[PDB]
Design a protein around this nucleic acid. Sequence first.
DNA 1: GTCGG
DNA 2: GCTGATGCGC
DNA 3: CCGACGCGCATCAGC
Length: 327
Amino acid sequence: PQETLNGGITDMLTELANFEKNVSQAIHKYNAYRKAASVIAKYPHKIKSGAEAKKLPGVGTKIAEKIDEFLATGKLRKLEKIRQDDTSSSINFLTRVSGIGPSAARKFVDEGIKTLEDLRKNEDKLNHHQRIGLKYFGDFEKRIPREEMLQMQDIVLNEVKKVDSEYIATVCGSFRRGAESSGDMDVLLTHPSFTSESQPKLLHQVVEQLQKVHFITDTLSKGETKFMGVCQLPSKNDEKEYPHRRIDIRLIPKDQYYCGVLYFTGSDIFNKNMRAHALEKGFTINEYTIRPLGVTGVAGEPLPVDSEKDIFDYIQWKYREPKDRSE
DNA sequence: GTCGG
DNA sequence: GCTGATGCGC
DNA sequence: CCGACGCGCATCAGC
Ligand code: NA
Ligand code: NA
Ligand code: NA
Ligand code: NA
């Protein structure tokens, strides 16, 4: 299907989704709208009525009614109204800043802070994360072309190996599945010395080396097992500099590493299907391990996993290449 | 808002 | 000061 | 009808 097919409807549902999440603070409604937009975005036909759309899982009575209004009038009165609402449109907007969620956006708008310009004039009211989100507001909304992700991976793999050749690092996400672009860089890291029964500095050493070579430019958060920050590729001589990008690095116990790589590689639809299969096969798979299930539903100890394939073998599933994990 | 036990 | 709740992003 | 739809880190709220 193509955007122009039911783009009006999916755009409408997505906009409704955002107001539910950022203004009404109804996360489940936010996801209901997203689910509806997704199922419709995959429908290979230009919808002619709400009834037609209602046959799709995720589209109920209310969304069907909204589709009827949109099809007959080319808009939704409720959406048009909230769109022009100064307060709501501002709260919704501010959450685009990383660090500013529904609560913060609401507080800011309540005190007259509604724009980036306003945020810029009120630095003392923003925490460290929010300040970084503001500074890179534009860059963070740009996608990362695969070619750049490759350049970024080169650097990450090189520096990690440089700190300790025994580290194992894997860039996951859609990138690992072959995507032509990514929204950020997700790095999974492990070390043989680190197991579930196991140093509290394995992550630090890597983050530090990446900062030393000036790849990592800012830190949103950093703990013993998870780092979230900002990075930027070196500027091509006198050529325009690259935009700053979001990068996360997670340290995971060796014995849980591949369940992690499998999970963070996705896609989400694939994960859902694989776990479903695992269950019907007597196994339960989460991001950390795969465990057998007894005849009464009791989970046993986690099974040994030394590769993604081990996971597939357990559930009698043929190994699936990342490129083929779209679903 | 949608689904389903 | 410490402990648990909350916000946030994923 | 009516409940469902996980966790690390930064920071706050309460003691
Ligand atoms: Na439906
Ligand atoms: Na935000
Ligand atoms: Na946001
Ligand atoms: Na070595």
